[PDB]
Ligand binder design. Sequence first.
Ligand SMILES: O=C(O)[C@H]1O[C@H](O[C@@H]2[C@H](O)[C@@H](O)[C@H](O)O[C@@H]2C(=O)O)[C@H](O)[C@@H](O)[C@H]1O
Length: 138
Amino acid sequence: PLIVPYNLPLPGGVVPRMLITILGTVKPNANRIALDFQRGNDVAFHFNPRFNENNRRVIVCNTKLDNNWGREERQSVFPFESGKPFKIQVLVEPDHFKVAVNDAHLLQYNHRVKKLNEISKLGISGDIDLTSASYTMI
Ligand SMILES: O=C(O)[C@H]1O[C@H](O[C@@H]2[C@H](O)[C@@H](O)[C@H](O)O[C@@H]2C(=O)O)[C@H](O)[C@@H](O)[C@H]1O
């Protein structure tokens, strides 16, 4: 396993056709998971499954600029389950990040941060056992 929180460097940032794959297992009684694609201190893409927000499960996505969070985008399709292994694939496309979980499309998030080649770290945190984090150009 990998130690959480985990930092995955993204050398030279991201670019369309870059596929980032995160493998892990959600802990029992999980509350949250976060994948934070960072441009320095800014968070270009916060992908944030929440397991118990007012007794609902929801995926929250957002961006943080100059330490301020923006307007969330929410997705109630929720493919994670406490205790179960998952695969998150984030495919950078020209206008959005495209996310699939366990080989099923989940959501897209349009690029708010434009300097893709400066989004040079992925932070992985929350209630998981992290098995691997890697990327490949497809
Ligand atoms: O303080 C809040 O209102 C929230 O703080 C966390 O959420 C932050 C951020 O405020 C939010 O815009 C973003 O989408 O997700 C962030 C995060 O850390 O996940 C709490 O998670 C949230 O429940 C609110 O309390």
